[PDB]
Scaffold this active site. Structure first.
Site, PDB file in Angstrom:
ATOM      1  NE  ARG A 158      -3.266  -4.438  -2.224  1.00 59.46           N
ATOM      2  CZ  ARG A 158      -2.669  -3.634  -1.342  1.00 59.46           C
ATOM      3  NH1 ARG A 158      -2.848  -2.318  -1.391  1.00 59.46           N
ATOM      4  NH2 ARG A 158      -1.877  -4.145  -0.394  1.00 59.46           N
ATOM      5  CB  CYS A 166      -0.949   0.006   1.188  1.00 60.90           C
ATOM      6  SG  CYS A 166      -1.857  -1.546   1.324  1.00 60.90           S
TER       7      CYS A 166
END
Lengths: 240, 246
Positions: free
Chosen positions: A123, A49
């Site tokens: 995600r 991330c």
């Protein structure tokens, strides 16, 4: 299994905490007439991330130019967000300019059906238009960083199909059948399909495959800029 | 809203009619230690879908090399499927090697949560990516009016294959990442001595305890990946519209 919003439906009406302030969705962006990409994460201080944020950061003005705001989401505090933003600027050099919805408890993740169980998942990417309707959804797993440039391709191309009333084809602007050609919606009637052939005003492979090239040179080359960038082995790494 | 499967679920056990015959899912592909990619489509004889088939075909070798089978799905008869394939051979000049699951009405598609309607079948546009333990690893829902980027699917499976094979996670934009380029990420540590021990080895390049990496992908691996993206990027030399009055 699990429940989610659907393409073509209107974004889930909600009020949220971000590290730039409370705002409403999709309202904050609809009022302004801007599109937004919403993109989600399991926890802050995750490396994949981190690379994704850094990658979004670099392409920030690229999104602004299109008329497209960015907004992240993770299930930690706003304080966790701030400290992480600081960590990235300090250790990587890049400032993150976009807001990050804070969602402890995972109430927003759940609401949106990124959470169903384990956080662990989450995600997901939502691309919402300026009528506030969902246009596209990507679910990349936690172990696989997104290709951010394809996200640029998708908004650019959606905007361009909306404006010109055209569908868009596999791999456009470098489609192998028609190149930078956009596609004319198929004719719902037979008297429409017939008069579409004998017209001779579009380039047709059959009644149901007609296309032209109404996209200007600057929309086309911008779109290719995006890909070439993805393809390019990068000049300087930012680690050193 | 609608219900759908989830990343890390097993692909629903089922048996599908295709134009290559009956095939069983995910077993058929699990049976050969094979990944598979499944992409759906609203109806036959549609423009975008046609350009995705052609695209997918032209990359079949890339997929075959990776260990990845392809299988499509649209809500129309095995008659139309096969008829649609003849059209693409006769008008584009390209033979679609892979099978297409027949599903008029669209039950197989509802079973996958690829339509949540009604009658209006505009919605049916997902891609599942399923691995060889028969488990969903990635899903993309483009819209009807926007064709996919097939070189990106190639990238995903490549990345996923390498991640598992090397026990690494994969950075944003890999192999062309900004921070670490071609590097792959070491699974962040869980405990306190894990964080210290790792810095006291230097075996990884590392910004902080939770951001370590190395470069373990062999040139081969990395070069093919990059080739997927270049191909994506290059304006095409010959268009198949023109190389087709022949």
């Amino acid at each position: 299994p699990g429940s989610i919003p659907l393409i073509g439906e209107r974004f889930p009406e909600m009020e949220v905490t971000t590290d730039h302030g409370r705002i409403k969705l999709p309202d904050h962006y609809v009022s302004q007439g801007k599109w937004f990409v919403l993109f989600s994460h399991p926890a802050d201080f995750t490396p994949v991330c981190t690379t994704e944020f850094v990658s979004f950061a670099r392409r920030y003005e690229d999104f602004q130019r299109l008329g497209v705001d960015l907004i992240g989401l993770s299930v930690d505090s706003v304080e966790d967000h701030s400290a992480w933003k600081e960590w990235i600027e300090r250790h990587i050099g890049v400032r993150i300019p976009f807001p990050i919805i804070a969602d402890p408890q995972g109430t927003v993740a759940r609401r949106l059906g990124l959470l169903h169980a384990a956080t662990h998942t989450v995600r997901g990417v939502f691309i919402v238009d300026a009528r506030g309707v969902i246009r596209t959804m990507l679910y990349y797993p936690m172990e696989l960083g997104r290709l951010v440039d394809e996200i640029l391709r998708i908004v650019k191309a959606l905007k361009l199909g909306d404006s010109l009333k055209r569908a868009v084809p596999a791999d456009w602007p470098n489609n192998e059948i028609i190149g930078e050609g956009l596609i004319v919606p198929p004719p719902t009637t037979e008297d429409q399909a017939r008069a579409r052939m004998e017209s001779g005003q579009y380039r047709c492979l059959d009644s149901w495959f007609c296309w032209d090239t109404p996209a200007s040179r600057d929309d086309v080359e911008e779109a290719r800029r995006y890909l070439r960038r993805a393809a390019e082995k990068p000049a300087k790494l930012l680690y050193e």
